[PDB]
Ligand binder design. Structure first.
Ligand SMILES: Nc1ncnc2c1ncn2[C@@H]1O[C@H](COP(=O)(O)OP(=O)(O)OP(=O)(O)O)[C@@H](O)[C@H]1O
Ligand SMILES: [Mg+2]
Length: 213
């Protein structure tokens, strides 16, 4: 073909693959907590960049504003969570989002069997995967300070890919893009989103902005 793109395909760590099918194939009632989990991740990443700037203000040259944006797109049926946090290196993506085992995974699977609410997911070190409560597919674009912009992607099925991102440059941070299931479109509604952020994400030490089309 005219153009070529390098893709790297990785198997999810076995327990995490198993946690993902559990999340996807079980019925759960309290799905809205996915949003709280992604906002926390953005909040953590922003704490991190903030921490690093204390000793090295140069680290904020890639953008000084520390914040989180929420972007529903009804045309594409996507909900995007953007932060100007620390972002992830390629290796961060690979190690931290699927490939390296987590201490709490087995235990969280155990708790789910007993009938735990999925809301507890974030106590175990696997909160990200709550996204698959409402998304058939998740794309993570990320730009860390001394590395290139990358795109992580997976629709489950036990696998994810990482590639150099060919999209619009970010400066610094992470964009999580949720391709929503057809029965989960309420999470594109301005009212629903506002309700959910007020109920679950009111201890975020950063400004959050909802962009409404
Ligand atoms: N928005 C983000 N910016 C930077 N790194 C992120 C972001 N989201 C996820 N990560 C990385 O992926 C890892 C997995 O996140 P996940 O939410 O599954 O677990 P956690 O936040 O470490 O713990 P838990 O969510 O269970 O309290 C995180 O530790 C973090 O390093
Ligand atoms: Mg988390």
């Amino acid at each position: 073909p005219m153009e070529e793109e390098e893709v790297e395909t990785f198997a999810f760590q076995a327990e995490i693959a198993q946690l993902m099918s559990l999340i996807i194939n079980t019925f759960y009632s309290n799905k809205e907590i996915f949003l709280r989990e992604l906002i926390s991740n953005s909040s953590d990443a922003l704490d991190k960049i903030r921490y690093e700037s204390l000793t090295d203000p140069s680290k904020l040259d890639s953008g000084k504003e520390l914040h989180i944006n929420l972007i529903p797109n009804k045309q594409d049926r996507t909900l995007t969570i953007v932060d100007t946090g620390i972002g992830m290196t390629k290796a961060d993506l690979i190690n931290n989002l699927g490939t390296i085992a987590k201490s709490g995974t087995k235990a969280f699977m155990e708790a789910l069997q007993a009938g735990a609410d999925i809301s507890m997911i974030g106590q175990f070190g696997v909160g990200f995967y709550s996204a698959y409560l409402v998304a058939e597919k998740v794309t993570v674009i990320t730009k860390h300070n001394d590395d290139e912009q990358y795109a992580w992607e997976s629709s489950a099925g036990g696998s994810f890919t990482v590639r150099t991102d060919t999209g619009e440059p970010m400066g610094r941070g992470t964009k999580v893009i949720l391709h929503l299931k057809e029965d989960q479109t309420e999470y594109l509604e301005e009212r629903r989103i506002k309700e959910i952020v007020k109920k679950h994400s009111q201890f975020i030490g950063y400004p959050i902005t909802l962009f409404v089309e």
